[PDB]
Structure 1
Amino acid sequence: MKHGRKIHRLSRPADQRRALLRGLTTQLLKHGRIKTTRAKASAMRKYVDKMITLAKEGSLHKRRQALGFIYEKQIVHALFAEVPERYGDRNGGYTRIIRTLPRRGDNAPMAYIELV
């Protein structure tokens, strides 16, 4: 009965869950700050952090590993060039969750996610 089961569903099937996390991850990486729900945000910390971690070891292999993910070549080339300079010190936890006011037309709880 969900004992020791840890996975953020996002109300969806696995079709669309990975589709969400992927696209959200892309847009977040692109813009640098996004407004979304608390759950859509709080689930997203495994994948942004995984991809920044993936951008430490900039090698043929790891770029393809990341490039299967993002579905936008020119964002993932921004990383690898960017990351090791502006995150070289920081050891994990590259992501901040600020939290701001429910959405109007459904009392949906709301948040900001952006790079730290």
Structure 2
Amino acid sequence: PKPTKGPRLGGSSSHQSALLANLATSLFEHGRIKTTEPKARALRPYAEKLITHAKKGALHNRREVMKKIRDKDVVHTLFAEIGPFYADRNGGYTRIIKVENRKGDNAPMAVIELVREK
């Protein structure tokens, strides 16, 4: 995907790599999370790449998703109940909805979740 244009979100490449992997894992584990809105914007490409890999189940995709997100539990649930459940849907896997601004620092939070209409 297109890289973040400005100075990066978390403050370094390794840090955002770990951050994005953790966000993707937690979001796929749970289903609906509330996070910083630009963070969800930058989250969208990673989760969508995971959905793309999931659509075609195979050993190479097993290893690709493993090397990306580092959890046997989340990769298994991803390949078992998320994967085939988006077989007939092309693109548009996540929804971004923003909510009341944070009290701590007035940062705009957005609730990002999988599409469960179908």
CA apart distance, 1:76 = 0.4
CA apart distance, 1:11 = 3.8
Instruction: Give a deviation string over 1:7-65, Cα, whole Å, max 9, x none.
Output: 22214100101111100000000000110011110000111010011011111111100
CA apart distance, 1:73 = 0.6
Partner of 1:114: 113
- Give the number of aligned pairs: 111
Does the residue aligned with 2:90 lie in a helix, a strand or coil? coil
Partner of 2:90: 91
| Structure 2: unaligned runs, 5 residues or longer | none
In structure 2, C-alpha distance between the alignment counterparts of 1:113 and 1:84, rounded to whole Å = 18
Q: TM-score if structure 2 supplies the norm length? A: 0.89
Q: 1:11 to 1:84 in 2, by over 3 A?
A: closer
Partner of 1:3: none
In structure 1, C-alpha distance between the alignment counterparts of 2:70 and 2:10, rounded to whole Å = 23
Report whether the alignment pairs 1:81 with 2:80. yes
In structure 1, C-alpha distance between the alignment counterparts of 2:47 and 2:84, rounded to whole Å = 17
Q: Which moved more, 1:78-87 or 1:90-99?
A: 78-87
Q: 1:50 to 1:29 in 2, by over 3 A?
A: same
Partner of 2:3: 7
CA apart distance, 1:84 = 4.0
**Residue identity in the other structure for 1:27:** S
Q: How do 1:1-116 residues align onto structure 2 when only pairs under 5 Å count? A: 6-8=2-4, 9-116=8-115
Cα RMSD of the aligned pairs, angstroms, is: 1.1
Q: Which moved more, 1:81-90 or 1:12-21?
A: 81-90
